Write a protein that binds this ligand. Structure first.
Ligand SMILES: Nc1ncnc2c1ncn2[C@@H]1O[C@H](COP(=O)(O)OP(=O)(O)OP(=O)(O)O)[C@@H](O)[C@H]1O
Ligand SMILES: Nc1ncnc2c1ncn2[C@@H]1O[C@H](COP(=O)(O)OP(=O)(O)OP(=O)(O)O)[C@@H](O)[C@H]1O
Ligand SMILES: Nc1ncnc2c1ncn2[C@@H]1O[C@H](COP(=O)(O)OP(=O)(O)OP(=O)(O)O)[C@@H](O)[C@H]1O
Ligand code: MOO
Ligand code: MOO
Ligand code: MOO
Ligand SMILES: [Mg+2]
Ligand SMILES: [Mg+2]
Ligand SMILES: [Mg+2]
Lengths: 245, 268, 245, 268, 245, 268
C-alpha cells in the first residue's frame, strides 16, 4: 500500500518566478484573486525564482562555480519573491514561512490563518545532483515533492502562458507550437524540446504516491486559478501516472 | 559557446532549452577544496561497535591529518533502522523517515567530536566552507554528519518508503560538489566480492570494477547504496571511489598513501 | 505564598518512549484516543526516549563518555518520537514544537491549535549533574518540571503497565510484585528497588509548587488516559506533597 | 566629567538631558580592531562583471593578507535594483525593500567565499568579533555582507522608498564602530571628478576633498551614498575614506601600502 | 504617492522601561487594563529598557566601549522587560515574539491570538550611528519606525508622567515646568532641554509616511491607555507632520 | 561488570534498576578537555566594578594563555538582582527568573569579548567543544556565559523563587563534565573566613577545608553557592576548587602556577 496522506485537505499553488517579474501589472490582479480564494481553500502558496536567478547563473557560471553552488543562490530569489507576495496579503493575515516551518509545522500555521507563503525551491543546496551545470531540482520540482509527500488534494502551477505547447510559443519555432490540453508525464519525458516546467518534475511524477494530475494555467488571466482549484479544465493537465486504489 | 551567447540564452529561453544547457556545459570548472579527501565512517560498520573500532580510527585520523586534509562524515546505523521500522509500520512517507535518519548520523558525529576535541578537530556544519580549520596544521580536518539536507523533499524510491539517498550519497555529493580529490568509504568488509561474503562462502574478491560491470554482475546494490553508482557516472570531479575495511588497523592510512587496499569503483 | 499559575488551564500528558517502541499496534489506538480528546482539553503532549536511548548509552559508555555527553544524545530520541506522533495527528492540526517555543510561546500556540507535541527531556545537556553514569533528569522529570512551573491543572504519565508495583512486573522477581493504587513521592523515594518513573521525579515533587498528584496509567488500554484526565482513578496515584492554600 | 557625576546623571536624568550627554562624551575611547582595514567590493562595479574583475581581486586579497588585516564587505548590485523596481512598483515601504537588498549582498559574499575557501579566508557573520581568523597568519581576513541590519526598521529617505542606508553605509559603520584604521571603497571609477565621467566628457579629477567642499560643488551624491558623508562628519574613529578603481590590477594593494591612488574624502 | 498600509488595523503600544522598573505596584494595574483591551484591538505591545540600561552604560562607558557596543547591550534589557510582561498575560494567550517574527510574520501571529509582546529597541546594533556616546535609536524610535512602516492606526507611548512639560518635572528646574497638551515634532526638535522621548523620534517623525499623531499618556493612571486608544485627549499629543491625501 | 552484562541490562531493565546503575558505574572514564582550566569572573565582584577591575584581569588573561589553556566564564551581578526583584515581586516562578539571569551573564561575556577580540580570544557558545581556538598558541582561550541552560526547567529551591543553580554551578559543571584539571572562582574576597569579612571584624581566614567541614561550621552558603558543595561531592573529575581575589593584581596568574593563594575547598 501507499503511505498515508498527512494533510489531505491541503491545496498547493506554485507561482512562476517570471510571473512575479512582470511587476504590479500581474501581481495586483493575482493578489486580488488569492484574497477571494482564502475562505474557500487551505492554501500553501509557493513562489519560483525568475530572471534574477538567470543573472546569478550568468555570474556564477562565469566564475566557474559548480552546480552545487548555484542551486542555493537561485533559491534566494524565490524566497524574496515569496516575501513580496506575502507582504501584499499581510492585511488578510498571510505571511511568509521558512522551509523548516513548512516541513514540520504546516498544520499549526494553517490552523492559525487561512494561507501562508513559502519558497518553492527544495533544500538540495550543495548536495544537488551533478551532470548539468544548471540546477535540476528547481521550483516546479520542489512544489510537487512537498504536495505529494503531504498527500495534498492537488497542485496547480501558475504560468505566464496558457499551458504546454509542442514548441516554445515565445521562441524561434513559435510558428509550429500546438497547444496541448492534456498530456502524461511519461509522454513529455520522451520529447526533447524545451518545456515550461522542470524536466525533473516528470521524474518525481513517475514515482508519485498520491497526486494524480497537475494543471498548468495562465495566471495572467483572472479566474483560471480559481477554476483550476475546482477541477475545471482551463489549462494543460499533466497525468502523473498514479491510479486510485 | 561564447559568453555573450550564453547570457543571451539565459535571458531569452527556458532553463529546459537544450541550447542553453549546452551553452552552460562549456563554462569553466572551479574546484573549491581540490586538496581535501572526504571519508565516511560507517554507522553499523564501525561506530555502533564501540571503543574496539572507534578508538583505533580516532588514532589513525589524528596521525593522518599531519599529511592529509580530511573531511570526515558519519553514518547512521542501528538506531536509524529502528526508526525506519517504526515510521514505516505507521505508513509515514519517505520524506518523514529521511528527517529521522539525520538525527542518528548527527548523534554519531557528536560522539566523535567528544573524542577528537582535545586534538583540535571540530564537529562542524558547512564542512565544505570550513576554511579556518582546513588551513591550520594544528587542525587540518573536520567532522560532519552524513545525511543530505533533502528532509521532507526527499525523492521517494520506486517502491517502499525507505529514503534512497542516505549517508553514502550525502558524503559522496559533498566530495563531488566541492571538487575534492578522493572519496573513501570505510565499511566492515574488505571490499566488493562476487557474492555477499556475509551470506556466501564461495565469494571472490573484486579489487577494481566499473559501474557498468557491477550492474551486469547484479552487484548494483551490494557494498554501496545503488543510487550512488548513478551519481558517480554523472559526476564532474570525483570519477572513482574506494571502499576499505575500517576494522583493519592502518587500512585508512594506507589508502590515503595510494596503496590499493579494498575495492576501487570507477565511473567508466 | 507560592508563585502564580501561568497556564492554569493546561493539561500535560507524557507518553513513555517504550510505548512508542511497540509500533503501530500501540500508536494507532493512542492516536485515536488523542484525536477524541482534542476538543475537551488544552493539551501539551510530551514524548520520552525509549530503547534507542539505551543503545546510545551502550555505545557512549563503551567509549567512556561522561554523563554530560550522554544526556543530550538520549534527548534526540525523545524528539524523534515526538515528530512521529505529531505526524500522525497533523490532519487534526497538531505539530511538533521546539523547547524554546514551549518555554516562551506555549500560550500563542495553544491559541492557534488545540494541542502540540514536544520532547519531554529537559535542557540539562552538558550541564547534567554528576554521580551516576546514567543521566538522571530524563523524560518523567522534564515533564513535571514544566507542568509545575506553568501551574498546569495536572500531569498524566502514560506507561506500558497498569502502574507502580512493589517490584518489576517484567523482571526476575515478578512473582512478588504487588500493585499500588496510591502512594506518596516520599514513600517511593525511601524504597530501593526499580520503578517505572525517574527517581529524580520524586525529588522535584518534594519541592513542587502547584501540582498535587500525578497518575500513572496504561496507554495500552484504550480509555484510561481519557478517564485519568477527568480525575478518575484507573492507575497509580502519586501524591507529591503539595497541599492547597 | 568625573565618573561619580556621570553615574549620578545616568540614574537621575533622562538620556536626552544635555548634561548627561556631555558627561558621557568625556568617557574613554576603546578601539576593538585598531589594526584592521575594511574594504567594500562593489556589486555592479566588480562582482556583477564576473571572472574578469573578480579573479584578479581574489588574487590581490590572497597576497595582501600576508601583510594587512582585512575585513572585506560585499555590495549588492543589479539583482538588488531589480527587486527595488518590483517592490517600489507595488508601493512597498523602504523597510521591506531593505530586507530584499540584504539577500543580494549575501549572495555576493557567498560566491567570494566559494573562491577564497581554499586560501583559508572564510565568509562570516560578526566580522568585527571574528577573533580567531583575524589573529592567524594563515588567514588574517574575513568576508561579510555589506547591508546593515536595520531591515524593516530602516529609516526612510525624505522622498521615495529606496533605502537610503545601503552597502556603503553598512561597511563604513562597521569600520567606525570597531575603530578600524582605514576604509577603502572599491568601485569601477578612478575616483571623484567635477562632473560624472560616465555622462560628462570635460570632467576633472579630484584627488582630495572634504565633505563640506563636496556639498558646495553639488557632489554630495556622486561616487558615495550621500548619507555616508554625514556619518563621516560624525565619526569618532574613521575620519577619512578612500575610493579606488578595482578594475585596475594592483590598485587595492597600492592603497593598502599608503599610495595616493584614487580620491580621499576627509570629514573636515 | 505614499507606500501602502501593510497592517492598517494594527494598534501599537509602547511601555516605558521605567514604568516596569516600578514593579508590581505599576505592572499589575497595567496588566489588568491590557487584559480588558484584548477584545477591543489588535495589539502589538513593545517594551523599553529602563534603569538596567543606564547601569550597562555606566559599566560600558567606564570600559571605553563605543556606542555601537552599548546599543545592543541596552536592547537586552528591553527584551527581558517584554518577557516579564508577556508572562503576566500568558493565561490570556499572549506571549513574547522575536524581532524576526515581528518584521515578517506579525500577520499570522495576530490571527492566532489577540496580542503579542516584543522589544521596542530596533536592530541597529553595532551599526548604530556615531556622534553621541549614548545610543540614539532607542525604544521610542524603534516603536515608531515599526508602526509607520506597517501603516498602523496609531502609536501610544505609556510613560510614568502625564506628558511632555517645558522642563523636567522631576529635575532641578521642576518649578518652571509647564504641561503641554499638544505640540508638533518640529517645535520639540528646536528646543534644547530634556524630554521624555528620544530626540531621534522627532527626526523619524519628520519623514513619517502614515502616522499623523502620537499621544504620550501616564500608565500609572488606570484608564488613560484605554481612552487614548479611542482617540481621547488624556495626555500630550505630538503632531508628526503627516497630512491626509 | 562485563559489557555483555551491561548491554543485557540496558535492554531488559529500567534505568532505575540498581544493577544497571552499578554496571554502568564500571564504564571507562574519558576526559574531553583534560588540559584546560575553567575560570569564573565574578559579575558584581569584578565586572560591575568597571575598568579598574576588568582591565588588569584582561591583561592577566592575555599573558596567562601563553602557558595555560583557559575557559573563562562570566557571572551576572547587579542587573540580575534587579530582575529577580521585579519578577519575584510579581510572583513569577524560578524557571522564569532563571531565563532573566542568563541575559545578564551573556551581556558581561560580550563586553569582555569587545576587549579581548584584538588579542585573538573569542566569545563562544559551546566552549567545551571549541576545538580550534583551544589548539592554537595564538588563541588558547575562550569566553562563555556562566548561567546553565535549564531555563524554565530550573529546579526550584526548597523555599523562594530565586534560581538555586546560577553562575557558580554553571561554570563548575562545565569543568566537571569535560574533565578539566582545575576550577578557579575569582571573587572580591581573599577567600573563606570563619565569619563574613564584610559584616564581621573578628573573622579568621581559612586556607583549606572540606565540604563536610564547611557545613559543620555553618559555612555551606558563604563564598560559593551552596548547591555547588553537593555537586562537588558527587563530581567525577573536579574534586576540589579554589577561590581567589580578582582585585589583587597577579592573583589569578599565581593560582594557575600552583601557588596556594586563596582558599581550597575539597570534596572530601
Ligand atoms: N513547450 C513549451 N510550452 C510552453 N511554454 C514554453 C515551452 N517551451 C518554452 N516555453 C517558455 O517558458 C516560459 C516560462 O518560463 P519558466 O517556466 O522558465 O518561468 P517560471 O516557471 O515562471 O519561473 P520559475 O521556474 O523560476 O518559477 C514561457 O513564457 C515560454 O516562453
Ligand atoms: N516497580 C515497578 N513497577 C512497574 N514497572 C516497573 C517497576 N520496576 C521496573 N518496571 C519496568 O519499567 C518498565 C517501563 O519502562 P520505562 O519507564 O523505562 O520506559 P518509559 O517510561 O516508557 O520510557 P521513557 O522513560 O524513555 O519515556 C515496565 O514495563 C516495567 O517492566
Ligand atoms: N520635558 C520633560 N517632560 C516630561 N518628562 C521629562 C522631561 N524631561 C525629562 N523628563 C523625565 O523623563 C522621565 C521619563 O524617563 P524615560 O523617558 O527615560 O524612561 P522611559 O521612557 O520609561 O524608558 P525607555 O525609554 O527605556 O522605555 C520622567 O519621569 C521625567 O522625570
Ligand atoms: O513561523 Mo510561526 O512557527 O508563525 O508560530
Ligand atoms: O513554532 Mo510556531 O512559533 O508554530 O508560530
Ligand atoms: O513565534 Mo511563532 O512564528 O508563535 O508560530
Ligand atoms: Mg515554468
Ligand atoms: Mg517510565
Ligand atoms: Mg520616555
Amino acid at each position: 500500500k501507499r503511505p498515508i496522506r498527512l494533510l489531505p485537505w491541503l491545496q498547493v499553488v506554485k507561482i512562476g518566478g517570471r510571473v512575479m517579474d512582470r511587476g504590479a501589472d500581474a501581481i495586483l490582479p493575482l493578489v486580488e484573486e488569492l484574497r477571494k480564494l482564502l475562505p474557500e481553500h487551505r492554501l500553501l502558496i509557493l513562489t519560483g525564482a525568475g530572471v534574477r536567478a538567470r543573472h546569478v547563473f550568468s555570474v556564477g557560471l562565469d566564475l566557474g562555480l559548480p552546480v552545487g553552488s548555484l542551486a542555493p543562490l537561485a533559491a534566494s530569489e524565490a524566497g524574496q519573491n515569496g516575501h513580496i507576495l506575502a507582504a501584499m496579503l499581510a492585511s488578510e493575515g498571510v505571511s511568509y514561512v521558512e522551509h523548516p516551518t513548512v516541513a514540520d509545522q504546516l498544520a499549526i500555521h494553517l490552523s492559525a490563518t487561512r494561507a501562508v507563503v513559502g519558497s518553492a525551491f527544495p533544500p538540495y543546496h550543495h548536495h544537488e545532483f551533478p551532470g548539468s551545470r544548471i540546477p535540476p531540482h528547481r521550483a516546479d520540482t520542489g512544489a510537487f515533492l512537498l504536495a505529494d509527500a503531504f498527500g495534498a488534494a492537488g497542485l496547480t502551477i501558475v504560468e505566464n502562458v496558457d499551458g504546454i505547447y509542442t514548441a516554445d510559443p515565445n521562441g524561434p519555432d513559435r510558428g509550429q507550437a500546438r497547444f496541448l490540453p492534456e498530456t502524461s508525464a511519461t509522454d513529455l519525458a520522451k520529447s526533447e524540446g524545451p518545456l515550461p516546467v522542470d524536466r525533473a518534475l516528470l521524474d518525481v511524477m513517475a514515482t508519485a504516491r498520491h497526486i494524480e494530475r497537475v494543471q498548468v494555467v495562465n495566471g495572467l488571466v483572472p479566474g483560471r486559478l480559481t477554476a483550476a482549484l475546482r477541477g475545471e479544465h482551463v489549462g494543460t493537465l499533466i497525468r502523473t501516472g498514479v491510479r486510485p486504489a | 559557446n561564447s559568453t555573450a551567447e550564453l547570457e543571451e540564452l539565459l535571458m531569452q529561453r527556458s532553463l529546459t532549452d537544450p541550447q542553453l544547457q549546452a551553452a552552460a556545459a562549456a563554462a569553466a570548472d572551479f574546484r573549491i577544496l581540490p586538496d581535501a579527501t572526504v571519508i565516511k565512517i560507517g554507522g553499523q560498520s564501525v561506530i555502533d561497535r564501540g571503543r574496539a573500532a572507534v578508538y583505533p580510527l580516532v588514532d589513525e585520523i589524528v596521525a593522518a591529518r599531519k599529511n592529509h586534509k580530511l573531511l570526515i562524515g558519519t553514518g547512521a546505523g542501528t538506531r536509524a533502522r529502528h526508526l525506519y521500522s517504526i515510521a514505516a509500520g505507521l505508513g509515514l512517507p519517505a520524506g518523514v523517515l529521511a528527517q529521522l535518519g539525520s538525527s542518528v548520523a548527527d548523534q554519531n558525529a557528536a560522539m566523535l567530536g567528544q573524542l577528537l576535541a582535545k586534538h583540535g578537530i571540530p564537529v562542524v556544519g558547512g564542512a565544505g566552507l570550513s576554511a579556518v580549520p582546513l588551513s591550520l596544521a594544528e587542525v587540518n580536518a573536520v567532522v560532519f554528519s552524513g545525511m543530505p539536507p533533502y528532509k521532507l523533499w526527499m525523492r521517494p524510491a520506486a517502491e517502499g518508503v525507505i529514503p534512497p539517498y542516505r549517508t553514502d550519497a550525502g558524503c559522496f555529493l559533498l566530495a563531488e560538489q566541492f571538487g575534492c580529490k578522493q572519496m573513501i568509504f570505510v565499511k566492515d568488509e574488505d571490499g566488493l566480492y562476487t557474492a555477499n561474503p556475509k551470506t556466501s562462502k564461495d565469494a571472490t574478491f573484486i579489487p577494481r570494477i566499473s559501474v557498468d560491470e557491477m550492474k551486469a554482475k547484479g552487484l548494483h546494490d551490494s557494498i554501496l547504496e545503488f543510487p550512488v553508482l548513478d551519481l558517480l557516472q554523472s559526476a564532474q570531479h570525483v570519477r572513482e571511489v574506494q571502499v576499505v575495511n575500517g576494522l583493519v588497523p592502518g587500512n585508512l592510512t594506507r589508502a590515503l598513501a595510494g596503496e590499493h587496499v579494498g575495492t576501487i569503483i570507477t565511473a567508466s
